Amino acid sequence: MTRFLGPRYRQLVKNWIPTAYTWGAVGTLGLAWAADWRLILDWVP
Amino acid sequence: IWGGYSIGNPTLSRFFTLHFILPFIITALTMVHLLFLHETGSNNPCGISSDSDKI
Amino acid sequence: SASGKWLDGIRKWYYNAAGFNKLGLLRDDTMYEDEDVKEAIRRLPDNLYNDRMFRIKRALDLNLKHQILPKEQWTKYEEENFYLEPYLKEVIRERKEREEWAKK
Amino acid sequence: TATFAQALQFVPETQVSLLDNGLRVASEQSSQPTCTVGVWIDVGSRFETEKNNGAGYFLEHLAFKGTKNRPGSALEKEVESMGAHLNAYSTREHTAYYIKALSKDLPKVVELLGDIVQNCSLEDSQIEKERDVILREMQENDASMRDVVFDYLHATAFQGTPLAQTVEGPSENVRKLSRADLTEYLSTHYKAPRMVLAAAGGVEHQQLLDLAQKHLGDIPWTYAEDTMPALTPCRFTGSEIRHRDDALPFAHVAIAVEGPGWASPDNVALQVANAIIGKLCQSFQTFSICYADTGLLGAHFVCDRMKIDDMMFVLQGQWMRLCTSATESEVARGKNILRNALVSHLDGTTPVCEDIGRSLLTYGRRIPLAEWESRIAEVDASVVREICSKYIYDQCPAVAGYGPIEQLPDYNRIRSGMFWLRF
Amino acid sequence: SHTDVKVPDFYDYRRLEVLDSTKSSRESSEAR
Amino acid sequence: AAVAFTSKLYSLLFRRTSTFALTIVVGVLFFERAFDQGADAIYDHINEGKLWKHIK
């Protein structure tokens, strides 16, 4: 591409990072809850 | 997928149910395929636009 | 230096092998119409536009009839006209400028 | 050579003083042969009850029609023989009377200006003539569609509160208002500590103050019996008003949320946001309308009837964009647009005089351009993100529409556009 | 013309959560 | 003024859609277990003496 190297794109990515890792948390916990994945669920009190 | 410890009677009925149902999914997806095609029209051997000589 | 004559030699060979000249077509006729090419075609003056359209229809008719022009009428490598290149270069410059604005 | 900000230091100061009755006198001297002088009054439609809604507009119609000292057209003839101009206006929240004149005429100007606000001759004949004129002026559809939709917006947003009501008032009232009502209105609201005497141009401050004591110092200041009317506190409602008429050429639409008011700092940042936003349709604008404790923050547009939905989509999408994804590069542009606007507005004496008056009523003080520049310089993309989120994101709007508005989206569809599911 | 406009009263339908007014507006919004 | 419960709940959890979704998965994890245990208790209690788990 080579187009998307520059200041605006860096700023724009920083704007969306938090939402990204929050959706990541949602997906991970959901997968674990759905497949009764003991590797993660054994650590939940 | 076997339904048991090995290939056996429970697997053959699965093969047969799936072989029965798939062709019709193929039919539906063929209709979608042509729907997509008719929005643009057919390419041709020369690779240049044919809108001056459509029949 | 000689290297120019040598490169032009292979280029002429490749041109005759391609064979769009047998159909009476110029090189700039044979481009695929992406976005930039369509915008360059929009910018042509009327005479060039009409000449292009007829040339293309004629090639299509010949292809329909599995035939080619007489050898006397083939497009020759040494007297061809790249009529579309200038307009295309301007279109591409404009798009590049806009991209470059978009990253600041 | 200077910098912009350094040029802002050369702008002269605004001097302010008080009389004994609490009237404040304010001036900016600019060494010119021409001047503007006015009185600004802290009264408007949001202090009227449904019994006398429309009184101030009535009073404005016969303000310049005669005083005891100058019966009838004598006042008009004396203004016109100086070559001066005389104007007035009335708002949801303020009132103003001013004069444009030569600097040579300041003693007469102030004199006339004091004669007008204390000694209008409310004669029955003139009252009835104004009554007929206002009724005639209301009978036919003499209103622009823009005014119609903005009045509708105030009515739906501030329903059950005094700000919903219009400046002109209903026709039922103008055919029924009496001289007693007019004189009671004046006696109750036109008190010295609510008034400002403002001047700009070739005016010296101490001369203006002497003339003010001579011609305005007898205005009373004792509010009596707390005769001032009791009224309902502020509230904003998310709601819609729809007036359908498929014969009008084009659809008019206005949509706001609630703004913070005059006093808050946040206004600056919001303005920047506005400048960033402002094709589909013919005409489009963004706006902020401030009051003492509340306001409207939104947009207005005109469309062909088949392109209302797309336009609403585009507008709400830009809002969500600013709340979630703003960047520095655009913010810089908006700040520059705002700088240019502020400095462009204050050209000539009239706007400057007007700014002095409005400022002393709303802020208690003149805010110099240097302070505005310092406030503008602090905004950045993070501030814009924060404050836009603080006032726009997931809020219930007020909507008004007039025209062929079948395609104006349903209220639930509009409310769901105030938030993103991917955030 | 238009100036005679007035929305009719909705008292019957509105929530008590705003009628019990001893709390800033936007905080109420949040509760609802 | 009045920090009230549902307002804190809106502002902390429900205002942002990702966090709303996360709240939902976390609630279902614990609801499932509590609800199962209660139901099994009731069931077992309705017909004590007749289930082979205890006769065993």
Add this chain to the structure above:
Amino acid sequence: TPMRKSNPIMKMINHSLIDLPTPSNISMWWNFGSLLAFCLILQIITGLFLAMHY
């Protein structure tokens, strides 16, 4: 209008394979899609019959 264009089902058929604009110059290599469809139909029919004895 002709009935060819009076009705959604008919007008879709018409836009599909009566008044569709096709290139004049396409060759035999473009016949194999219709043959594919034919083959699918043949397979479904012969299969439904076999099914009743297997």
